[model samples]
Target: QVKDFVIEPPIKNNLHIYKTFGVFGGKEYSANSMYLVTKKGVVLFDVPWEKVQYQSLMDTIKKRHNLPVVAVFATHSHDDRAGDLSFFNNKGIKTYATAKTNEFLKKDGKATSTEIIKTGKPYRIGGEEFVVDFLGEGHTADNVVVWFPKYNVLDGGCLVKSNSATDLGYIKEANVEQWPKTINKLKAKYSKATLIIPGHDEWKGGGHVEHTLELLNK
Candidate 1:
């Protein structure tokens, strides 16, 4: 039997990906979802694919804090991350996709929805007061990583690999040659950042940013 949903205290500021469903690289393909609980309410960084995956998230959220999902932020326009917007849209939850991302969503973000509902806002919720630039065109054409000074963490979202480097990111349309410079600009801009949450793997220390920049540059 399906249960009522709820939210709980955030596990930790540290970031990690979970295999909520499906398979990738011969294992269950993990859907990357990040959530951070604030005093205001819970803000989900990304939602997984299909109803069951999302329901799992909803169940986790509710069990953890009894908090309502105030918002859902899409870092890029991918079917995996942005597929089930209407489920939350029907709930009247505020949502966002980068302008380019919004356009991508309209073109390709589909799993079980027809029109991509417009939240008409950027991913700039939570009363931001720091340099969080939408550095463009890296992992995907619609990729927009957020640099948060409040937590000194950049929600890099798959741009920087936590374990190994890969040049295979959206390679067909990726800004492959420029990825190095783009990442460098992030390192330079957020030199004070203490943590970087990569979209796939884990919470990396700021020093790794420079190493990651170098790795991708090669």
Candidate 2:
């Protein structure tokens, strides 16, 4: 059931968040995907968990922004994050993720990103700056975070907890022991982040960053 696929108002500037739903264990889980509408085109982050909604996401972008999606980046190798990589690539949207992430995707027999993103370097896409960073392992071994310096926004993906998340959702791929250290590194580096977008639920900037740390500590 892909109900309640929500497109929220912009999170300041050209950034927008789109949400999709997935059900596990009779519980509906929400995941957030983001995009930036720029003069050149749109830059997408992550993809819908439901493969059925992949075309819907592209159609929504085309109608709303009236611009082509120039690129797509997945924060991790999970189905929710990179499920549509191949789909987007088929549409000619350049896909990117860490090499390790792509390796995992390849092993899982899922769609792997076409391009390898080396961490800690600034990549200018659609006239904006994006840095894919791997501070440390937390959500998944190959999970990484994306930072937009021009907007002072941190796309924490699933590594960062949502303000409304009661507990760390799934930890089969998590590293609780190293998660805190990773969060600490994030806090120290991007302390001035204006907004932080989690992989799911509500995102409230720095508050959610602290909340993620809180959950880890507890």
Candidate 3:
């Protein structure tokens, strides 16, 4: 079970991609961690669950962009997303997570000592306008999607499904009944989004949202 989900090679976008592996329910899994390399600094979303890769990830960024990581945004409190909170905090990087996410992280000893993003409020970071909005909970109550209107990119995290996902994967903290409606709200709000990145699996267009909706209805 663990071998099937081996971490794939990184795939680049306008931003950078970092891949890592983990295990859930006795099944091996992989997810994508993303970072935006700008002249000012690096802005990261989520982190690797595989601790050994952490330094290499940062080294790769520094070698490629020659910038320090300035800020981090975890889409939720899940280990697959917020796994490296303490690592980043120790490096003195600024971080932000929803209040709910911080609460969950604190319990796991991976809590980030950073500002709390007010839900639905637009925030400016690293020369881009973004928001950590809660449409509804799917993967977890603290689940949030990041919108980068300037790039027409929606980092849907695990709240949005990937094209390869035939089922909703893990849903221990998920509000199964509400998942579909939550996704609908996202589609309507960011209808213009040209690129959608799921927490794991391939990044694609807006159809991933639709694919998730279909899974919910099934």
Candidate 4:
């Protein structure tokens, strides 16, 4: 959905020191949300949880850069991860999600009013192409994993966790048995990903990339 208004940019493009959100295991933390600052403006991949924390995210962004939010990428339509969509929409940021995800978001994208994203849409940033895949059915039907081939970053959306076990082994609409095969394809596709940023946790480097993919394969 489109917004007929204007707002300031309040995030930075620091993928290296990406602050964490969400209080995992009773400790306060930040959810994974990455910002990419381009020549025109900035685009955010996934938003934080809750209004207060998301607003803090915006505050952090504003402190780092001075640009307007141009677009937002919804990795999946899950509530905890995508709860604060409207905050960005009010400022006229466009929400992009997979076709199936767009459908999921429509049911939940009330505040943000998404601009439906087609499957396989390439997100261009810093002269790189991040390809979106929706065929995988782990995490949720709308879960989309992105491959930044050049950067060797796999933006896996809640498909697997880093150095930990998933909270639940199943979801009503998820393909319980196929998660392994699905992630294997992702592993094969991104065999060289030096780093992997999941939808639920902090960054993982080195063989952890292969190791986590192996978790799903198990």
Candidate 4 lDDT, 34-144, residue by residue in tens: 666665565667765545666565565566666555777777777554566777777777777666765676676455446766666676764435676775777677688
For candidate 1, give the lDDT: 0.57
74-94: candidate 2 lDDT, tens digit per residue: 889898898758788887888
What's the ranking of the predictions by TM-score, best on top? 2, 3, 4, 1
Q: Top model by lDDT, which number?
A: 2
Model 3 lDDT tens row, 22-120: 766798676966777655788878877666666666776777677778888888987778776777888888788888898888876776647787878
TM-score of each: 0.74, 0.93, 0.87, 0.76
Model 3 per-residue lDDT at 122: 83
Tally clashing residue pairs in candidate 2: 0
- Model 3 stretches with alpha carbons more than 4 Å out: 1-14, 23-28
lDDT of 2 at 83: 79
lDDT of each: 0.57, 0.84, 0.76, 0.60
Once fitted onto the true fold, the runs of candidate 2 whose alpha carbons sit more than 4 angstroms away are 1-3
Positional deviation of residue 36's Cα in model 4 after best superposition, in angstroms: 1.3
- In model 2, how large is the Cα lDDT of residue 201? 82
Query: Where does candidate 2 have its weakest 10-residue lDDT segment?
Result: 1-10
